[PDB]
Amino acid sequence: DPFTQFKQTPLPYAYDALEGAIDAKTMEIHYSKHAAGYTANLNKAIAGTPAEKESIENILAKVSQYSDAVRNNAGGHYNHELFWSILTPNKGTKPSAALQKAIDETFGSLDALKEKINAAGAARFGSGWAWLIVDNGGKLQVTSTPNQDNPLMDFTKEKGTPILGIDVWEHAYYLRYQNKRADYLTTIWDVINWEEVSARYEKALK
Amino acid sequence: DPFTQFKQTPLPYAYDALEGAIDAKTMEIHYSKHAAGYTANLNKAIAGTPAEKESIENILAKVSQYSDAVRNNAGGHYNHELFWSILTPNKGTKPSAALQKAIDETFGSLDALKEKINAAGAARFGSGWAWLIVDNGGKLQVTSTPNQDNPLMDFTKEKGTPILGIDVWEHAYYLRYQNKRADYLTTIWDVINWEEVSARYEKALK
Numbered sequence: 037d038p039f040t041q042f043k044q045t046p047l048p049y050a051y052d053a054l055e056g057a058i059d060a061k062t063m064e065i066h067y068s069k070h071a072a073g074y075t076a077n078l079n080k081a082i083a084g085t086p087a088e089k090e091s092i093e094n095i096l097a098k099v100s101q102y103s104d105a106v107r108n109n110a111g112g113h114y115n116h117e118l119f120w121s122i123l124t125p126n127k128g129t130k131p132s133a134a135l136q137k138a139i140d141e142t143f144g145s146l147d148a149l150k151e152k153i154n155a156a157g158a159a160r161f162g163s164g165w166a167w168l169i170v171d172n173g174g175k176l177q178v179t180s181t182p183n184q185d186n187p188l189m190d191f192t193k194e195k196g197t198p199i200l201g202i203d204v205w206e207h208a209y210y211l212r213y214q215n216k217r218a219d220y221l222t223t224i225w226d227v228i229n230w231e232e233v234s235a236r237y238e239k240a241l242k
Numbered sequence: 243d244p245f246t247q248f249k250q251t252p253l254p255y256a257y258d259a260l261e262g263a264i265d266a267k268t269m270e271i272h273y274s275k276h277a278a279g280y281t282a283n284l285n286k287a288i289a290g291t292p293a294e295k296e297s298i299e300n301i302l303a304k305v306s307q308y309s310d311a312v313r314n315n316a317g318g319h320y321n322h323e324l325f326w327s328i329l330t331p332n333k334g335t336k337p338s339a340a341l342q343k344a345i346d347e348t349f350g351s352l353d354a355l356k357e358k359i360n361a362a363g364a365a366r367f368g369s370g371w372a373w374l375i376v377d378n379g380g381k382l383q384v385t386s387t388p389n390q391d392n393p394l395m396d397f398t399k400e401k402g403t404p405i406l407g408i409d410v411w412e413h414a415y416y417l418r419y420q421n422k423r424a425d426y427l428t429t430i431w432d433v434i435n436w437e438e439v440s441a442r443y444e445k446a447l448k
């Protein structure tokens with residue numbers, strides 16, 4: 037149906053494409069059950085409200101005006117859409133010159149950034165997300181959020197434009213890693229698409 | 243070491259005893275990794291604090307006064323301890339007469355209570371627990387809480403003594419049920435120990 041307000045973007049690789057870090061069964065369920073549900077429930081939650089014809093970014097920026105169903109599903113739809121875009125089967129991507137310079141000046145090195153994101157992801161108690169965001173004015177920051185909340189939402193304390201998000205809900209890693217969230221975090225770097233992260237950085241700075 | 247403040251209680255059944263409903267691998271990881279970690283981290287978090295020699299119920303009743311590490315791990319330890327006790331491989335347990343009468347007057351029947359708990363468990367967005375409690379007026383209530391929070395904590399909205407708790411963190415059901423939380427909740431009734439729930443109800447009323 038072309039007329040639904042929000043749609044999932046088709047995955048740009050096969051479910052088994054990310055097997056260097058994420059099992060195929062998880063990819064299938066995570067995309068076709070969890071993420072699909074957020075999209076469908078978002079379209080239902082906004083129907084008949086002032087969010088009905090708003091962009092996802094505008095819904096998130098005003099999300100406290102709306103129901104909890106709008107918050108949770110707007111978050112879930114945005115977050116998962118971003119997540120698929122920042123994964124790739126193509127090994128060896130790296131930050132753009134501009135992003136690498138910013139990472140090095142702000143954290144010291146790519147390894148230092150990864151360590152900070154790993155720690156943020158590990159420290160998120162319960163369900164949530166780890167993020168790299170660009171704050172207003174352009175500074176990179178690492179944060180985490182609960183459940184499907186994100187850095188675009190009006191009440192989130194550390195606000196900014198996400199350029200990388202990593203899902204630390206247990207559904208994202210339990211089939212392959214069970215309790216070992218730290219091993220998921222260490223391994224997922226092998227499938228992070230730094231070209232997409234860099235494109236999002238470029239767009240955030242405009 | 244007998245002198246640690248908190249210890250795990252061994253299970254009253256084998257890891258594989260609940261296979262009608264919960265896989266052996268989940269039982270083992272859930273007990274020996276997740277729950278063991280809450281107990282160990284609780285002991286560390288209270289050390290050198292005013293919680294150090296308090297009973298678990300007294301730590302919970304003042305939990306707003308302590309660190310997140312105390313809150314999250316005191317809840318986690320309590321909740322899991324209770325959980326293992328309310329599971330059994332012995333089929334066909336039933337509520338005591340006193341508990342059955344209260345269930346029937348409050349909910350209508352045992353099926354109606356199960357439906358209410360199943361709905362509370364499904365509606366808990368993110369990680370958490372569904373509960374049957376005896377409130378401060380001696381009445382039964384069904385609730386849910388986020389993360390490792392529970393009805394003994396001073397900041398929980400619906401306070402009371404838990405007599406039954408069901409874990410709806412994804413680690414509790416993902417290996418067998420994946421996204422189908424509702425199927426886990428339907429099935430777990432097959433291994434609920436209503437004799438222990440009834441014992442906890444009798445104690446709460448005293």
Ligand SMILES: [Mn+2]
Nearest residue numbers: 070203205208
């Ligand atoms: Mn997810």
Ligand SMILES: [Mn+2]
Nearest residue numbers: 276409411414
């Ligand atoms: Mn658990």
